[PDB]
Amino acid sequence: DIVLNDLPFVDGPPAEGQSRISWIKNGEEILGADTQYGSEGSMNRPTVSVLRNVEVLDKNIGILKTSLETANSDIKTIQEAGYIPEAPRDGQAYVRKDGEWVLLSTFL
Amino acid sequence: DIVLNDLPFVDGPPAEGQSRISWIKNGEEILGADTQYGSEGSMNRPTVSVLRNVEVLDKNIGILKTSLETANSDIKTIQEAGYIPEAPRDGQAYVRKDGEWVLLSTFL
Amino acid sequence: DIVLNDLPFVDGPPAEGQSRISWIKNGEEILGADTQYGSEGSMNRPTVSVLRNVEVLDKNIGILKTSLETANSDIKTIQEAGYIPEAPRDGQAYVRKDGEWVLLSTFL
């Protein structure tokens, strides 16, 4: 079973491990960040929350990619195993010789 | 064929079922929400649109996960089927005995 | 091997091909766009960056979908190949007739 991460922020009642996004409200102080790299401030808040979800989605795609790569590899192994197909269904018995089905009667 | 959902909001001319994102414009009233949980207001508008796309992406990943789980299960079934590999290609006829290829001549 | 696109914008030190997101800063001019369809302006900047990541994620999911469709098709081909299962492991030699394993002794 493949286990993916739940999104950390939702626009509605949260479930286990999630938080509700806090949109910008009127009457709230409209501020930005105080450092060249910080993300604090109400003006940035909801976008920071959406980016956190985007980071989780990126990791979930990486989990699916790894699993798909494994499937592709397993498929290639089956294709190269050299399994043999069915023999004619004509009421005659067949044996295997040189990669083909040959009539048993030919040897009796 | 796997059918995924198209993103609902795009930053360009929309196609069927899509809407163009409306960025914040100068000369527009800069407002937020009036409830503790609402997302109304120009200051929230473009971010709400991007979150809608994020919700759709999350569902699309869930669709791929289900399909991949089914593939993994089908692969496991093939690996456990016990298909048999090719017999030597040496000009001799072979029959099956105790999970191996044995020379027909040994019984004639 | 499946090759996916890296996200173009990150909230931290960037790696090859990435740029650091520029959050809204205090002391910065708070502006929007001047056209009905433009996305310029500090108020839109971080959200535009997150949308660029969302567009890349959408393409990465499309890459995984194509690869999974190919796997599904390869699996279907293996299921329809008609490979044959193992014969009884009871110390007796078997030959193939009418889609079943039959005792060689029956023909000797």
Curated annotation (Swiss-Prot), chains A, B, C:
Pfam families: Fibritin_C (PF07921). InterPro entries: Fibritin_C (IPR012473). Residues 50-79 form a coiled coil. Gene3D superfamilies: 6-Phosphogluconate Dehydrogenase, domain 3. Cross-linked via an isopeptide bond to E.coli host protein DncV during infection. It is found in: Virion. Homotrimer. Interacts (via N-terminal domain) with neck protein gp13; this interaction allows attachment of the fibrous collar and wiskers. Chaperone involved in tail fiber assembly and retraction. Acts as a chaperone helping to attach the long tail fibers to the virus during the assembly process. During phage assembly, twelve fibritin molecules attach to the phage neck via gp13: six molecules forming the collar and six molecules forming the whiskers. The central domain consists of 12 alpha-helical domains (19-40 residues long) with coiled-coil structural patterns. This is Fibritin. It comes from Enterobacteria phage T4 (Bacteriophage T4). The gene is wac.
